[PDB]
């Protein structure tokens, strides 16, 4: 279907407690496939999905080298941030990074991303055109100029349109059996009385992949927000996702409320009624 | 200065000796490399250092012992080598951020030999221009022949009236193995200096062929019949001829 | 992991003609790319590098290179080659090692021979006498044309050097020469360069 690959890294300085904690993860759509943790024993990029274990030693050696190199880059970036923001060498700080590519249903390139955040605030982000940057502030402005003079945008662009797409397409094929299927939500509704004149209706969606889903309560066919709760989509731990939405109703009016469920694995949106 | 420096430039060793290569770099770089290079081959990585810490060891035998005193210096201590360790030892330097690049040093030319008794300075002769070439062309070519040297490296230069000349000189780019039978035979090199017949024919002109040799030093010790074959210049000379 | 291939170990061009030196690499991302040149005595000089962006790179000594992504090639080019370009050539990739610190991986190298352009050859053989001794001499084969092959030393007594090119710049005059000698009992230059001994 339509698809993405993403990498995330988080560096956390811990002055006096040693070098920064570094943790990186790779995703294809909503499926994690690799990880690296600077505090782990192996000091290796490690598999997190079975289809990535098809790759041979040369892959693992290469990805390990490149991820370790990146941990060193971002460690240095923690250092440089201290000087730009004029901060004490004693603080603990956080640097976060994300990049990736989207491809169409037959593997055509659609989009690339590259972004940094410092202490949870945007720092620098490659623009949609993949040839320039949005600097969040004056610090990131210096980085932007530095990246322009060296041709960082070109080298990021070529990665996003080339290696990123090529890898994504390959992972999709090797992991077709699981990455290329949707799990439509299994749905049901529950009824609980809260008093003698009120009940709770809860709409459930379980066992779905991917995570994107919408759940909507209507009363007489009209969107209802009052007296509802809606939890954040949540992982089951087994690769699939869970969600629910609840509405308070007066006893004897249950038949007036409807729950709608939308998910790519559903040909037509579902409707549940008590 | 975008220059990595290495000493010594040339070195000769027996199988017993201890020596040290030194490498220096002023570019502020935090990564430095040692390589070994044999003839007809590319540089082969031995060591990487990042932040004065050893990052990569390419199964380097213990007879090579690396050291990093500070971010500017890298040493390579050499102890009890074999003849097969004879090679170009290249130091290199690189940034750890920005635009990746490597700057190479000029290298240490190392010869390890079974016994220091193999080491000889060159004999040097200068040969006067032929009368026939003069008659044919009105040019006059001098020839310098340096022979019987080991190890296989000399710097040859021409000197006319007390001044080095580069004009009209050509030197064999590589020494000649005098007898390819011995795995340790001596070498010869030749050079040519081509001047006008009239200049050659002015008997005030002084032509000196100078051959810098690299061999033993005061550091090494010598207990043999012959004279101690130290790092030296040996020369031959010739005056112009009226005829 | 990262390997580099220079498919042609040895290339020969005539002075003034154009040169292409092929280089391919194999790596799961786009690495840093380089061409070095090395003369026999010295260490390695950088010619050019790709980081980069534009596929066509300009270097020193009149060298350029073209990066071809669909090929993974980084071919060294030069419009008009000078005799002194004759050297060893290495392309290299820069990429993380297993430890994350960066390193160079070299191809096996390409030997470049260039056939020098020598103007108006006038081949000849000369005998030169020591400026000190009486019976000590050498032979000079000179002013022959670049096609001419110098053969091996043959009999163990006669040493013969390879070609050598001298570029007297302010004359426009270039010429080849080779030297011969022996300690053998005063054998003749006449037949020292193997030409139907008589």
């Amino acid at each position: 279907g339509s698809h993405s690959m993403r990498y995330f890294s988080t560096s956390v300085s811990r002055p006096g407690r040693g070098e920064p904690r570094f943790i990186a993860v790779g995703y294809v759509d909503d499926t994690q496939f690799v990880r690296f943790d600077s505090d782990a024993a192996s000091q290796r990029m490690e598999p997190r999905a079975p289809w990535i274990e098809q790759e041979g030693p040369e892959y693992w050696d290469e990805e390990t080298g490149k991820v370790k190199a990146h941990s060193q880059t971002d460690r240095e970036n923690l250092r440089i941030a201290l000087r730009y923001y004029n901060q004490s060498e004693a603080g603990s700080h956080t640097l976060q990074m994300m990049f990736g590519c989207d491809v169409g249903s037959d593997g055509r390139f659609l989009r690339g991303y590259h972004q940094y955040a410092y202490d949870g605030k945007d720092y620098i982000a490659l623009k949609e055109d993949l040839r320039s940057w949005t600097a969040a502030d004056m610090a990131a402005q210096i980085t932007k100029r530095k990246w322009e003079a060296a041709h960082v945008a070109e080298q990021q662009r070529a990665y996003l349109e080339g290696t990123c797409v090529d890898g994504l397409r390959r992972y999709l094929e090797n992991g077709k059996e699981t990455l290329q299927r949707t799990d439509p939500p299994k749905t049901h509704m529950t009824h609980h009385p809260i008093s003698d004149h009120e009940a709770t209706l809860r709409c459930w969606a379980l066992g779905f992949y991917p995570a994107e889903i919408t759940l909507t309560w209507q009363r007489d066919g009209e969107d209802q927000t009052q007296d509802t709760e809606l939890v954040e989509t949540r992982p089951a731990g087994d690769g699939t996702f869970q969600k629910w939405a609840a509405v308070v109703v007066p006893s004897g009016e249950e038949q007036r409320y409807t729950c709608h469920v939308q998910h790519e694995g559903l040909p037509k949106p579902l409707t549940l009624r008590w | 200065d975008t220059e990595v420096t290495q000493t010594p430039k040339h070195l000769v060793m027996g199988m017993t000796n201890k020596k040290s290569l030194k490498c220096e770099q002023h570019m502020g770089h935090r990564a430095m490399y040692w390589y070994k290079q044999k003839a007809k081959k590319p540089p082969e990585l031995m060591f990487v250092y990042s932040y004065e810490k050893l990052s990569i060891n390419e199964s380097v035998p213990s007879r090579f012992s690396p050291e990093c005193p500070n971010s500017s210096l890298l040493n390579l201590h050499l102890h009890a080598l074999q003849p097969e360790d004879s090679a170009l030892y290249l130091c290199a330097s690189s940034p750890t951020s920005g635009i990746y690049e490597q700057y190479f040093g000029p290298g240490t030319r190392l010869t390890v030999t079974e016994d220091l008794k193999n080491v000889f300075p060159p004999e040097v002769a200068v040969f006067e221009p032929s009368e026939a070439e003069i008659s044919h062309t009105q040019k006059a070519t001098l020839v310098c022949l340096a022979t019987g040297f080991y190890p296989d490296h000399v710097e040859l230069s021409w000197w006319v009236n007390g001044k080095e000349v580069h004009s009209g000189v050509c030197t064999d780019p590589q020494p000649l193995k005098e007898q390819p039978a011995l795995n340790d035979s001596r070498y010869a090199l030749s050079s040519r200096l081509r001047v006008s017949a009239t200049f050659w024919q002015n008997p005030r002109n002084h032509f000196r062929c100078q051959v810098q040799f690299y061999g033993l030093s005061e550091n090494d010790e010598w207990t043999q019949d012959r004279a101690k074959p130290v790092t030296q210049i040996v020369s031959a000379e010739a005056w112009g001829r009226a005829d | 992991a990262q390997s580099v291939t220079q498919p042609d170990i040895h290339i020969t061009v005539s002075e003034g003609a154009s040169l292409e030196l092929r280089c391919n690499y194999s790596y799961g991302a786009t690495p840093y790319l380089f061409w070095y040149v090395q003369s026999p005595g010295q260490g390695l000089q950088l010619l050019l590098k790709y980081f980069s962006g534009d596929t066509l790179v300009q270097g020193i000594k009149g060298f350029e290179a073209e990066f071809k992504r669909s090929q993974s090639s980084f071919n060294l080019r030069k419009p008009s080659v000078h005799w002194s370009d004759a050297a060893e050539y290495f392309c290299a990739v820069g990429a993380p090692s297993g430890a994350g610190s960066y390193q160079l991986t070299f191809g096996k190298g390409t030997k470049l021979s260039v056939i020098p352009n020598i103007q108006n050859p006038d081949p000849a053989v000369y005998q030169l006498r020591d400026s000190k001794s009486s019976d000590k001499s050498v032979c000079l084969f000179t002013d022959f044309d670049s096609q001419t092959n110098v053969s091996q030393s043959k009999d163990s007594d006669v040493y013969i050097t390879d070609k050598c090119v001298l570029d007297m710049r302010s004359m426009d005059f270039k010429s080849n020469s080779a030297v011969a000698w022996s300690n053998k009992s005063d054998f003749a230059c006449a037949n020292a360069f193997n030409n139907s001994i008589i």
């Binding site: 990498y7 790779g26 990029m45 290469e62 990805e63 490149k66 991820v67 190199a69 990146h70 880059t73 240095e76 970036n77 440089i80 941030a81 730009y84 990049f99 210096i142 980085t143 530095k146 990246w147 060296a150 960082v152 080298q155 990021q156 990665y159 290696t163 990123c164 090529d166 890898g167 | 951020s97 920005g98 635009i99 990746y100 | 799961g28 991302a29 786009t30 690495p31 840093y32 980081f51 990429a95 993380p96 960066y102």
Partner: peptide, 10 residues
């Protein structure tokens, strides 16, 4: 497949 980030220095 991870990129090279040697240039991503602030």
């Amino acid at each position: 497949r991870f990129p090279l980030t040697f240039g991503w220095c602030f």
